[PDB]
């Protein structure tokens, strides 16, 4: 058992035996280990990593050396070959509004992030990598195959830099390379109010003594707030429209301008939050600023939670949510909450559910103006279409009314992730989410397959009929074992993706086991949980049980029309209820009566 208790990018920290709050840094929720579940540490194992030399090296980082005998193939070849269709027609989820893909989006956020190493950012460091496509120390540049339309037009890779690891982020060699999770492992809404101290400060409005979070001070959205912007020189949200030059947002989580419905979903949460501090104001006209704003923090984590675990998670695990998940009888504390590494990657079924284009929609919910339907590749850091177009009504009822893509095992990745994605340093809409999601399995030492069949107890194909029955889908294994030899070798995060979904859900069986396995712990492993006894008055979670995603949309854009359940798709107006039908969270039991 060769390491014991290395702990290097985090700072102290002393523990607050009451407080009936969350650290901000997600310290202190286990009494015995405090340090579990807090962010900048290791992502946990559930396996031991693998990497080309047993430490650090990914597979596929020295030419000669095999995994099992065979070559790994190239990550975007598998892109291409597998991963890639033309068609959009047919591609929509029948049963998904877009919001199912936008939440998972979210809950992601709030759960996990492995940054790219920041050493040595002013050093030729970018330069050599992303020029020359020169592999060596943190490049490790996804290289085009031979007959790559990208050869001929951008260049001979993409470049790639490998994630962080914990302890210093100075090479590595005494135990295995471990990368950090940056972010709070507990369902806590750390993407909205920050993983660290220094970030947590900033994005409060202290001014005033009312626990609110900052607001935009430049721009408003017909009287109701936006996020901060980012400060922060050169911003992708600029670099895409030197013209309007717009800054991305400031939230809690740093990626929260990747896509506008994004920024839409952590602008609604914002508003929540100091939609609530309010409330408990105008009710506890004594409270001060820090307890209106632990208050206010406490509930909108209940909120996520909530909407997660009654609403998201039962239309993901389907007929295996029961399995995973059995209905909760309380705080235990011997379950570690901390997110796997593995779980990094099998959270990135999202990807699949992304469609080729985003719409506003107005009051009617027809087409808002001229160009209300825009290609998703137009929108990655795309802060001005909201700001200076329309504010996040009209990408809300998108949200609403329009569908997710289906994951289809011969339509994966729509075009605009899997050859347009736009990088916050790179400077085109020219990059592979897809072939990008396969070598990050490799760089972060990934079980394959067959390891990962074997950890949920499922079958491990050996041959291509084996592996045929398992996807149902001759050509799907054909193709699968020409490229890597054996489903050994196949990367946990297109096996587990290829999988037909299970009754009810959207995942196949290999990943129901890996999601459900983490969101059972990351439940049953918080002291913060909603539902633990103690954590919140009886009266105070009968009021939380009525909390919905719809009821949020109400409360804080002027959309007065919603469906009663945003997940499932929705056709206007058939489905859509006026908002006073909708339950409201009923703040009365947060009275506190010390008069
Ligand atoms: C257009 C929408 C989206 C875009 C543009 C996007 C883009 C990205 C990018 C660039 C990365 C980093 C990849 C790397 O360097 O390895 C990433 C990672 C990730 N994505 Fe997404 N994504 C989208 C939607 C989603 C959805 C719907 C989900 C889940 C339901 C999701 C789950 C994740 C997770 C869990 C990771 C790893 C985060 C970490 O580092 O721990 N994504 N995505
Ligand atoms: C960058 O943003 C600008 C301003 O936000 C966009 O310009 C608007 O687009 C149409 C003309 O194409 C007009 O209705 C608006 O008046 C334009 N405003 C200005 C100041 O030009 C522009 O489309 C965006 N450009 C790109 C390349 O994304
Ligand atoms: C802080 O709150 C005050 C008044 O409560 C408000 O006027 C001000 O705009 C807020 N500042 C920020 C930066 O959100
Ligand atoms: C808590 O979790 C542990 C280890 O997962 C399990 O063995 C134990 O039975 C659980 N304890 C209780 C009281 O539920
Ligand atoms: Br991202
Ligand atoms: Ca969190």
């Given at each position: 058992?060769?390491?014991?208790?290395?702990?290097?990018?985090?700072?102290?920290?002393?523990?607050?035996?009451?407080?009936?709050?969350?650290?901000?840094?997600?310290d202190?929720?286990?009494?015995?280990?405090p340090?579990?579940?807090?962010?900048?540490?290791?992502?946990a194992?559930?396996?031991?990593?693998?990497?080309?030399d047993?430490?650090?090296?990914?597979?596929?980082?020295?030419?000669?050396?095999?995994?099992?005998?065979?070559?790994?193939?190239?990550?975007?070849?598998?892109?291409?070959?597998?991963?890639?269709?033309?068609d959009?027609?047919?591609?929509?989820?029948?049963?998904?509004?877009?919001?199912?893909?936008?939440?998972?989006?979210?809950?992601?956020?709030?759960?996990?992030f492995?940054p790219?190493?920041?050493?040595?950012?002013?050093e030729?460091?970018?330069?050599?990598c992303?020029?020359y496509?020169?592999?060596?120390?943190?490049?490790?540049?996804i290289?085009?195959?031979?007959?790559?339309?990208?050869?001929?037009?951008?260049?001979?890779?993409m470049?790639?830099?490998?994630?962080?690891?914990?302890?210093?982020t100075p090479?590595?060699?005494?135990?295995?390379?471990?990368?950090?999770?940056?972010?709070?492992?507990?369902?806590?809404?750390?993407?909205?109010?920050?993983?660290?101290?220094?970030?947590?400060?900033?994005?409060?409005?202290?001014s005033?003594?009312?626990?609110?979070?900052?607001?935009?001070?430049?721009?408003?959205?017909?009287?109701?707030?936006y996020?901060?912007?980012?400060?922060?020189?050169?911003s992708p949200?600029?670099?895409?429209?030197?013209?309007?030059?717009?800054?991305?947002?400031?939230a809690?989580?740093?990626?929260?301008?990747?896509?506008?419905?994004?920024?839409?979903?952590?602008?609604?949460?914002?508003?929540?939050?100091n939609?609530?501090?309010?409330?408990?104001?105008?009710?506890?006209?004594?409270?001060?600023?820090e307890?209106?704003?632990?208050?206010?923090?406490?509930?909108?984590?209940?909120?996520?939670?909530?909407?997660?675990?009654?609403?998201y998670?039962?239309?993901?695990?389907?007929?295996?949510?029961?399995?995973?998940?059995?209905?909760?009888?309380?705080?235990?504390?011997?379950?570690?909450?901390?997110?796997?590494?593995?779980?990094?990657?099998?959270?990135?079924?999202g990807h699949?559910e992304?469609?080729?284009?985003?719409?506003?929609?107005?009051?009617?919910?027809?087409?808002?103006?001229?160009?209300?339907?825009?290609?998703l590749?137009?929108?990655?850091?795309?802060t001005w279409?909201?700001?200076?177009?329309?504010?996040?009504?009209?990408?809300?009822?998108?949200?609403?009314?329009?569908?997710?893509?289906?994951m289809?095992?011969?339509?994966?990745?729509?075009?605009?992730?899997?050859?347009?994605?736009?990088?916050?340093?790179?400077?085109?809409?020219?990059?592979?989410?897809?072939?990008?999601?396969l070598?990050?399995?490799?760089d972060?030492?990934?079980?394959?397959?067959?390891?990962?069949?074997?950890?949920?107890?499922?079958?491990?194909?050996?041959?291509?009929?084996?592996?045929?029955?398992?996807?149902?889908?001759?050509?799907?294994?054909?193709?699968l074992?020409?490229?890597?030899?054996?489903?050994?070798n196949?990367?946990?995060?297109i096996?587990?993706?290829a999988?037909?979904?299970?009754?009810?859900?959207?995942?196949?069986?290999?990943?129901?086991?890996?999601?459900?396995?983490?969101?059972?712990?990351?439940?049953?492993?918080?002291?913060?949980?909603?539902?633990?006894?103690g954590?919140?008055?009886?009266?105070?979670?009968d009021?939380?049980?009525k909390?919905?995603?719809?009821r949020?949309?109400?409360?804080?854009?002027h959309?007065?029309?919603?469906?009663?359940?945003?997940?499932?798709?929705?056709?206007?107006?058939?489905?859509?209820?006026?908002?006073?039908?909708?339950?409201?969270l009923?703040?009365?039991?947060?009275?506190?009566?010390?008069?």
């Open positions: 058992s060769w390491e014991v208790g290395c702990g290097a990018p985090v700072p102290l920290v002393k523990c607050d035996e009451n407080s009936p709050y969350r650290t901000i840094t997600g202190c929720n286990n009494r015995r280990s340090a579990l579940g807090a962010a900048n540490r290791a992502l194992r559930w396996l031991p990593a693998e990497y080309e047993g430490l650090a090296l990914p597979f596929g980082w020295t030419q000669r050396k095999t995994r099992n005998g065979f070559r790994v193939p190239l990550a975007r070849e598998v892109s291409n070959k597998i991963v890639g269709y033309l959009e027609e047919g591609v929509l989820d029948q049963n998904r509004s877009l919001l199912f893909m936008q939440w998972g989006q979210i809950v992601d956020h709030d759960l996990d492995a790219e190493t920041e050493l040595g950012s002013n030729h460091s970018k330069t050599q992303e020029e496509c020169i592999q060596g120390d943190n490049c490790f540049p290289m085009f195959p031979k007959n790559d339309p990208k050869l001929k037009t951008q260049g001979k890779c470049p790639f830099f490998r994630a962080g690891f914990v302890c210093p090479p590595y060699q005494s135990l295995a390379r471990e990368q950090i999770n940056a972010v709070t492992s507990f369902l806590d809404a750390s993407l909205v109010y920050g993983s660290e101290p220094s970030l947590a400060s900033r994005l409060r409005n202290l005033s003594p009312l626990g609110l979070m900052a607001v935009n001070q430049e721009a408003w959205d017909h009287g109701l707030a996020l901060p912007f980012n400060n922060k020189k050169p949200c600029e670099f895409i429209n030197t013209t309007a030059r717009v800054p991305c947002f400031l809690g989580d740093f990626r929260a301008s990747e896509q506008i419905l994004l920024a839409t979903a952590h602008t609604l949460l914002l508003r929540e939050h939609r609530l501090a309010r409330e408990l104001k105008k009710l506890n006209p004594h409270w001060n600023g307890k209106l704003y632990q208050e206010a923090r406490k509930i909108l984590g209940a909120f996520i939670q909530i909407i997660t675990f009654r609403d998670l039962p239309i993901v695990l389907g007929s295996e949510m029961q399995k995973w998940i059995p209905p909760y009888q309380g705080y235990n504390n011997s379950v570690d909450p901390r997110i796997s590494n593995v779980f990094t990657f099998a959270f990135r079924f699949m992304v469609p080729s284009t985003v719409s506003r929609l107005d009051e009617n919910y027809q087409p808002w103006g001229p160009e209300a339907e825009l290609p590749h137009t929108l990655f850091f795309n279409r909201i700001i200076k177009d329309g504010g996040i009504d009209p990408l809300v009822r998108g949200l609403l009314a329009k569908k997710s893509k289906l289809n095992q011969d339509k994966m990745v729509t075009s605009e992730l899997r050859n347009k994605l736009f990088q916050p340093t790179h400077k085109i809409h020219g990059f592979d989410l897809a072939a990008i999601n070598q990050r399995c490799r972060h030492g990934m079980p394959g397959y067959n390891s990962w069949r074997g950890f949920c107890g499922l079958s491990q194909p050996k041959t291509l009929k084996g592996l045929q029955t398992v996807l149902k889908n001759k050509i799907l294994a054909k193709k074992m020409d490229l890597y030899k054996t489903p050994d196949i990367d946990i995060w096996g587990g993706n999988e037909p979904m299970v009754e009810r859900g959207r995942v196949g069986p290999l990943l129901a086991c890996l999601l459900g396995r983490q969101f059972q712990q990351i439940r049953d492993g918080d002291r913060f949980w909603w539902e633990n006894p954590v919140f008055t009886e009266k105070q979670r009021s939380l049980q909390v919905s995603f719809s949020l949309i109400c409360d804080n854009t959309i007065t029309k919603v469906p009663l359940h945003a997940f499932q798709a929705n056709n206007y107006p058939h489905d859509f209820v006026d908002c006073s039908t909708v339950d409201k009923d703040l009365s039991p947060w009275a506190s009566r010390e008069n």
